[PDB]
Copies of this chain bind each other. A is one copy, B any other.
Amino acid sequence: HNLIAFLSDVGSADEAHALCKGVMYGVAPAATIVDITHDVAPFDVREGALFLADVPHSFPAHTVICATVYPETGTATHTIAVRNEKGQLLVGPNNGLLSFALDASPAVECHEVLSPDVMNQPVTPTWYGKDIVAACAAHLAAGTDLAAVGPRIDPKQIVRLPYASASEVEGGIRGEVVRIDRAFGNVWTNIPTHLIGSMLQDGERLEVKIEALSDTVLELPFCKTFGEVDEGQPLLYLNSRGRLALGLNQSNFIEKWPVVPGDSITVSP
């Protein structure tokens, strides 16, 4: 595994995430390190998990996914090392961070990271991120056996985060805002491609209510892509993996209709 993909909440504005790569480089000088992001919101293990959901599929099987948003650092919350179905390794706090990454490619084997010989010593209690997660990630990239990191554990011993699921209701489908595509202000839902094919049939616009905004009701064209309506006009579309989203063509949807994650969305014919 010569590729190490690296995510955290330490930011990219100071030297911290780079000290981590320094440790990794020394351990695994044959390795390539690519940053996922270091801009996860601080302590926000669910934001990080969401960022990581599509990382398994996008990255080659020879990747180590090294991840650390670890406000539980220096406590009884351990680090885990996981082999997934794709053959990738993934290292991080057992705090639910890897939950959605594992939804895409389940755990096949899991170990708690307990061995001193895969840690950067002496381990600093406020930076398990660098001393255990990053170092272990580098040891594995460097050819270390997974079983050498510490004791096997059962996959149910991996902490999982609840994720709401969209459903059929009254006369359409009810889901919620999962996240915002912050670079553009597009809104992303948890509504899968399959649920809405009944109301996709007729070429007519759909009804969308967002209840968090004094109960806003929009009528909206279901589009393949942004360019299909006039600039600044709203659309509905399937985002880049298979969820319903809302945006304005070459404008910012949420600046116009201020939704947050959690907000309910119903679509109906």
Contact = CB atoms under 8 A, between A and B. Distances in A.
Interface in A218-247: 224-228, 237-241
A238 to B, nearest CB: 8
Contacts of A63: 22, 25
A15 B74 contact: no
A146 interface: no
Pick the most buried of A36, A224, A225: most chain B CB atoms within 10 A of its CB.
A225
Contact of A18 (B37, B228, B240, B249): B37
Pick the most buried of A2, A10, A23, A34: most chain B CB atoms within 10 A of its CB.
A34
Interface stretch (A51-59, A104-112, A164-172, A259-267): A51-59
A39 B59 contact: no
Contacts of A58: 18-19, 22-23
A11 interface: yes
A63 B29 CA distance: 11
Contact of A183 (B21, B42, B225): B42
A182 interface: yes
Pick the most buried of A21, A51, A183, A249: most chain B CB atoms within 10 A of its CB.
A183
Contact of A16 (B33, B71, B183, B226): B183
A144 interface: no
A15 B100 CA distance: 14
B33 A34 contact: yes
Nearest to A44: B250
A178 to B, nearest CB: 13
Given A21-B34, A72-B227, 17 more contacts: A2-B29, A3-B25, A15-B52, A15-B54, A15-B55, A18-B36, A18-B37, A18-B58, A25-B59, A25-B63, A26-B60, A71-B227, A124-B239, A124-B240, A125-B224, A126-B238, A126-B240
